Amino acid sequence: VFDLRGRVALVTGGSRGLGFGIAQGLAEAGCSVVVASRNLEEASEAAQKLTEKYGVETMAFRCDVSNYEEVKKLLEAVKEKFGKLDTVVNAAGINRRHPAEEFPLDEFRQVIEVNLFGTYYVCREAFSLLRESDNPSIINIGSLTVEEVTMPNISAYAASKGGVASLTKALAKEWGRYGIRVNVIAPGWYRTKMTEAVFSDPEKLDYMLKRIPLGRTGVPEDLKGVAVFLASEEAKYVTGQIIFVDGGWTAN
Amino acid sequence: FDLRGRVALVTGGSRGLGFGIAQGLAEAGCSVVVASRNLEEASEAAQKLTEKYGVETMAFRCDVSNYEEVKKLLEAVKEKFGKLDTVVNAAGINRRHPAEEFPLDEFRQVIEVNLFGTYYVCREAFSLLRESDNPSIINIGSLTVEEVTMPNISAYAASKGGVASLTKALAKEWGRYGIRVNVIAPGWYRTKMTEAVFSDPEKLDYMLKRIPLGRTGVPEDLKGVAVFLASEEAKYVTGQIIFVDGGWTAN
Ligand SMILES: NC(=O)c1ccc[n+]([C@@H]2O[C@H](COP(=O)([O-])OP(=O)(O)OC[C@H]3O[C@@H](n4cnc5c(N)ncnc54)[C@H](OP(=O)(O)O)[C@@H]3O)[C@@H](O)[C@H]2O)c1
Ligand SMILES: NC(=O)c1ccc[n+]([C@@H]2O[C@H](COP(=O)([O-])OP(=O)(O)OC[C@H]3O[C@@H](n4cnc5c(N)ncnc54)[C@H](OP(=O)(O)O)[C@@H]3O)[C@@H](O)[C@H]2O)c1
Numbered sequence: 001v002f003d004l005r006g007r008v009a010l011v012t013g014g015s016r017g018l019g020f021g022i023a024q025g026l027a028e029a030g031c032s033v034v035v036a037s038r039n040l041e042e043a044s045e046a047a048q049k050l051t052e053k054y055g056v057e058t059m060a061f062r063c064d065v066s067n068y069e070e071v072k073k074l075l076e077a078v079k080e081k082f083g084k085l086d087t088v089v090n091a092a093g094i095n096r097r098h099p100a101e102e103f104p105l106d107e108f109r110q111v112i113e114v115n116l117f118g119t120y121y122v123c124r125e126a127f128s129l130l131r132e133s134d135n136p137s138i139i140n141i142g143s144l145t146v147e148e149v150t151m152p153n154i155s156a157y158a159a160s161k162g163g164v165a166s167l168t169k170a171l172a173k174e175w176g177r178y179g180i181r182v183n184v185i186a187p188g189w190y191r192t193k194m195t196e197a198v199f200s201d202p203e204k205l206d207y208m209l210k211r212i213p214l215g216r217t218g219v220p221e222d223l224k225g226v227a228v229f230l231a232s233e234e235a236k237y238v239t240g241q242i243i244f245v246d247g248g249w250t251a252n
Numbered sequence: 253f254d255l256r257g258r259v260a261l262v263t264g265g266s267r268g269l270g271f272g273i274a275q276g277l278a279e280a281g282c283s284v285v286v287a288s289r290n291l292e293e294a295s296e297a298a299q300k301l302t303e304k305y306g307v308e309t310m311a312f313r314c315d316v317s318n319y320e321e322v323k324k325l326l327e328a329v330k331e332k333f334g335k336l337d338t339v340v341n342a343a344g345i346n347r348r349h350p351a352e353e354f355p356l357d358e359f360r361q362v363i364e365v366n367l368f369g370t371y372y373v374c375r376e377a378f379s380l381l382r383e384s385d386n387p388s389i390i391n392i393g394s395l396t397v398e399e400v401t402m403p404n405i406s407a408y409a410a411s412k413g414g415v416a417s418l419t420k421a422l423a424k425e426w427g428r429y430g431i432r433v434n435v436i437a438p439g440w441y442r443t444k445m446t447e448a449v450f451s452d453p454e455k456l457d458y459m460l461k462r463i464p465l466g467r468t469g470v471p472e473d474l475k476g477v478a479v480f481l482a483s484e485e486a487k488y489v490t491g492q493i494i495f496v497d498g499g500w501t502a503n
């Protein structure tokens with residue numbers, strides 16, 4: 001039980017940070033893992049570390065998820081390597097920080113293109129394989145911004161993540177009839193390349209910690225359990241949900 | 253709840269829910285700028301506000317998915333009135349397809365209108381709203397902020413959840429200027445956008461089962477809440493998603 005041996009997962013943004021943490025969790029449970037990002041060497045390095053540590057089959061593929069044709073090719077590559085797909089983790093994401101009244105318009109759309117459009121494109125193109133799975137599970141990565149916007153200057157990102165939440169609900173609704181579960185993991189505050197600047201400001205970090213009942217920020221390992229749980233047959237009656245892994249942030 | 257001397261910009265004010273809201277604001281004494289893609293329809297809607305309520309109006313053609321057109325819309329508001337107190341972002345579209353078959357251009361287009369367009373209007377309205385002693389932005393959500401009751405509306409749902417989170421981000425950033433940003437999330441109202449749903453007796457029967465008040469919404473149901481949120485009496489209300497849904501979300 002919670003065994004994912006023989007399963008195949010696609011992890012966008014699997015080359016580092018939270019996506020890599022999730023990829024490790026799935027590989028540790030026996031899942032074969034496809035790592036997609038925009039840097040092929042980094043994706044390949046991550047894939048190779050997964051095979052070395054966990055003994056699972058892996059593949060690396062260069063894909064900008066905001067580019068639909070590349071997503072279509074990503075999914076065709078999965079089908080060719082594995083012939084199957086059970087689990088999608090949409091962890092590819094960017095952030096750009098500006099006051100909303102000065103936000104450059106190309107950057108505003110770009111953040112939504114990667115975070116929201118790209119997440120849709122991957123779900124859309126994964127559908128035909130996921131329909132062939134006896135245990136199909138889509139895991140989208142949200143953020144606290146699904147519920148609350150705790151920092152200034154992240155309007156585009158917030159928009160993208162609220163969009164991912166509602167998209168997740170729509171897909172859960174439409175694709176439940178095919179047995180396809182669609183859920184969001186919404187992380188709290190985790191030190192990564194994306195959040196480095198915030199973490200480097202001791203005033204912001206002290207404020208963050210005051211709002212975390214467990215008394216620490218998140219590490220990638222904190223996401224491994226919930227990812228494996230949602231991928232597994234043990235979460236077969238769980239769909240359309242937004243699950244916060246945030247040390248109690250949203251409860252206080 | 254007097255809006256006399258106030259100026260509102262209503263996108264999607266030419267018909268349906270935006271028009272009902274425009275009427276509510278005008279009835280409370282607000283001057284109204286009606287913006288939509290059809291100048292005749294916007295102009296006629298604006299003139300009906302002036303005739304019925306005796307307020308100053310203006311109509312201006314704008315496709316809210318086009319940033320330069322939105323910039324020009326706000327220049328037009330400044331030229332006509334020199335001020336702006338209230339923004340209602342009611343411009344919106346829907347396109348219905350199974351998610352797995354949704355055409356990619358239409359998927360983006362629904363988000364371009366509903367979410368990017370709502371953002372562009374807020375962004376361009378900022379400089380005038382900053383000068384108001386009672387600034388209030390009212391974004392139009394949907395049940396899809398919380399729950400997706402129908403199939404074939406993935407793009408629309410994504411747009412409206414986007415709007416809800418955008419609203420919170422703006423409320424967060426602009427609270428320091430006293431600018432309130434809130435969402436009115438309607439339940440089910442018979443309009444041009446929902447006609448196809450309403451025309452299916454099975455679907456309508458299902459919808460009414462899920463409405464404690466036992467009826468669908470009409471544009472008049474949104475007048476009070478729009479006026480309330482625009483008024484000086486809602487000064488401590490910001491970042492909220494308020495459902496006007498006959499109890500849908502409670503059951
Ligand atoms: N860290 C947090 O506190 C936090 C909180 C809530 C949610 N999140 C979310 O968690 C996810 C992972 O972020 P992270 O914190 O782990 O940051 P990260 O270390 O910077 O990882 C982001 C990943 O996405 C990839 N990526 C970015 N744009 C892409 C695109 N267009 N196509 C394909 N891959 C792309 C990156 O690879 P490349 O740069 O090479 O493409 C990388 O593998 C994102 O959805 C983010 O919004 C993070
Ligand atoms: N009816 C409901 O049950 C319901 C429920 C929840 C939310 N809503 C929302 O309520 C709002 C109003 O919709 P409705 O039901 O009243 O539908 P509607 O009768 O079709 O009205 C839509 C309005 O938006 C305008 N519009 C559409 N695209 C535009 C664009 N690109 N630029 C500027 N104006 C644009 C339309 O005018 P032109 O076509 O002339 O541009 C019209 O004034 C929408 O945001 C919708 O999503 C409706």
Ligand SMILES: [Mg+2]
Nearest residue numbers: 147148250252
């Ligand atoms: Mg909270």
